[PDB]
């Protein structure tokens, strides 16, 4: 798996349209994708014996990459746990794996989102790079209906070489990012 639609149809379409739209000097001066990083978080290192790398492999299906556990630092005595030993759950996607995920996300996921209308327009709001989150885990294709103990969500963050959030606002809408402007 070495070249997908978003891959190809970035260099052979979206690439030139931005050197036009903005008039750059360098192949490096144009915006690219750096990285996509998803985070689950939850907070379920509690009682009743809490396993939940059970739900970290169902995350590894949709992405293909195996996620690392992320731990705690302070202590919310207000709503339980402290110290360390916790739940937060994370994975960093770079290239190929990157596009493959984004591919199915744009073709099959956001479509599957119960009502939907388009992504929120200004979750860049300035600082280059973009962020979105989700309620459901089953709007994903490779994850089934009958293998759910309990639906849950995630926080998808997408990074970019572009300085301003104009340069970025373009690059993503061109690869097919549905916007509720």
């Amino acid at each position: 798996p070495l070249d997908v639609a978003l891959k190809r149809k970035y260099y052979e379409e979206v690439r030139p349209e931005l050197i036009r739209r903005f008039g750059y000097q360098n192949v490096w001066e144009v915006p690219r994708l750096e990285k996509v990083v998803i985070n689950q978080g939850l907070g379920e290192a509690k009682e009743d014996a809490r396993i939940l790398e059970k739900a970290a492999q169902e995350l590894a299906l949709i992405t293909g990459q195996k996620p690392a556990v992320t731990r705690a630092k302070k202590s919310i005595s207000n709503f339980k746990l402290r110290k360390g030993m916790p739940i937060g759950l994370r994975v960093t996607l770079r290239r190929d794996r990157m596009w493959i995920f984004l591919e199915k996300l744009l073709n099959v996921a956001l479509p599957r989102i119960r009502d939907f209308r388009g992504l929120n327009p200004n979750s860049f709001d300035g600082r280059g790079n973009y962020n979105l989150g989700l309620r459901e885990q089953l709007i994903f294709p490779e994850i089934t209906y009958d293998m759910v103990d309990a639906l849950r969500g995630m926080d998808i963050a997408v990074v970019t070489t572009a300085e301003t959030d104009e340069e970025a606002r373009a690059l993503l809408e061109l690869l097919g990012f549905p916007f509720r402007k």
Partner: peptide, 30 residues
Amino acid sequence: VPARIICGCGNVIETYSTKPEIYVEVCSKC
């Protein structure tokens, strides 16, 4: 591995994932 997604709206998308057999009710075509 490489894979095919099979919509309830006829269409067939060809990407990769794991497990190649995928019945989906609707992609980006409605």
